[PDB]
């Protein structure tokens, strides 16, 4: 009932900021570029330094013309609207945003530990305590997002950054949707798609709890529960609802996963009468202090190597391309609300 009051306050704050988003809170020549941290079909993310303060940030730069070309207008505007409106310990903070003739810019706190993905593939797999530490943060994050009627829809280790204290930061919301009932879009990453998405059903927030099962499985095993050479063959396995577990999985872990990786929506944990508490109260989470996780007081099992501010060792190396700003304004009408 402290959770009830907390979430109602959180929803009132979200909705005020959703209805009146912030705009145009810095400009490009306030920053020096340091390094490209990631590329993509219509954008890049760069490590930048704010000239006045010397603070480092991650700057996402989206080429408006490419956004239009790849049909990503709504997704791009939606991500920025979400980021400036949410507030939760495991969601990245949007510090500034602005646009010019060519690009949209979102400036976020720099998360120096990189994607969980790299750490998982390097180490092979996480122990169950290590996996549980990360899983608890996702459970709280989905409890928050779902209470705002936001379905996340692209959970995966790639989308989970690790901060300097070893805790998770979610940065991408390009597929999230505010949807109190059902929605229908085929979207996500093949390994993480819930069966009802593959089967072209109307679906709801229960897809996020299925994806948590896939994440917990892949963290604890080192590989996801359903894989194949091609996505079409991944989908056949997913909808079969046949899963095999490594022999080192505990009984508690297998029981939780049978209940998350549940094809039948009337039986999937997270979607039942008791909602999220079926997950929080499950034996695999018995040792979890949910409040201490929220308060970031639990000692993290893994701390990324960080040699100071602006260390980029946990990201891959990319070819540095120019940041061109056209003499002509591109796509002004499409992006007015950014």
């Amino acid at each position: 009932e402290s959770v009830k009051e907390f979430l109602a306050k959180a929803k009132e704050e979200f909705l005020k900021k959703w209805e009146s988003p912030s705009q145009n809170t810095a400009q490009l020549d306030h920053f020096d570029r340091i390094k490209t941290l990631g590329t993509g079909s219509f954008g890049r993310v760069m490590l930048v330094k704010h000239k006045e303060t010397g603070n480092h940030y991650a700057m996402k730069i989206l080429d408006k013309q490419k956004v239009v070309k790849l049909k990503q207008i709504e997704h791009t505007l939606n991500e920025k609207r979400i980021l400036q409106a949410v507030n939760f310990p495991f969601l990245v903070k949007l510090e500034f945003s602005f646009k010019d003739n060519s690009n949209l810019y979102m400036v976020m706190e720099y998360v120096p530990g990189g994607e969980m993905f790299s750490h998982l593939r390097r180490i092979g797999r996480f122990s169950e305590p290590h996996a549980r530490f990360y899983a608890a943060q996702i459970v709280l994050t989905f409890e928050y997002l779902h209470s705002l009627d936001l379905i996340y829809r692209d959970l995966k280790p790639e989308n989970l950054l690790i901060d300097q204290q070893g805790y998770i930061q979610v940065t991408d919301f390009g597929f999230a949707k505010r949807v109190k009932g059902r929605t229908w879009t085929l979207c996500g990453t093949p390994e993480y798609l819930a069966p009802e998405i593959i089967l072209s059903k109307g679906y709801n927030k229960a897809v996020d709890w299925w994806a948590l099962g896939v994440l917990i499985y892949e963290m604890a095993a080192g590989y996801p529960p359903f894989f194949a050479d091609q996505p079409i063959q991944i989908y056949e396995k997913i909808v079969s609802g046949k899963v095999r577990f490594p022999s080192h999985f505990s009984s508690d872990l297998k029981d939780l996963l049978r209940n998350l990786l549940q094809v039948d929506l009337t039986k999937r944990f997270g979607n039942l009468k008791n909602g999220v508490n079926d997950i929080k109260n499950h034996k695999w989470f018995a040792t979890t202090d949910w409040i201490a996780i929220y308060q970031r007081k639990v000692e993290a099992p893994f701390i990324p190597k960080f040699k100071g501010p602006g260390d980029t060792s946990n990201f891959d190396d990319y070819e540095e391309e120019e940041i061109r700003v056209s003499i002509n304004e591109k796509c002004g009408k499409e992006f007015t609300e950014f």
Partner: peptide, 18 residues
């Protein structure tokens, strides 16, 4: 092994959304 099958899948690297 299951691990060997995962390597042979060719989907061990970063995965894009559909």
């Amino acid at each position: 092994t299951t691990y060997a099958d995962f390597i042979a899948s060719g989907r061990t690297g970063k995965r894009n959304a559909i």
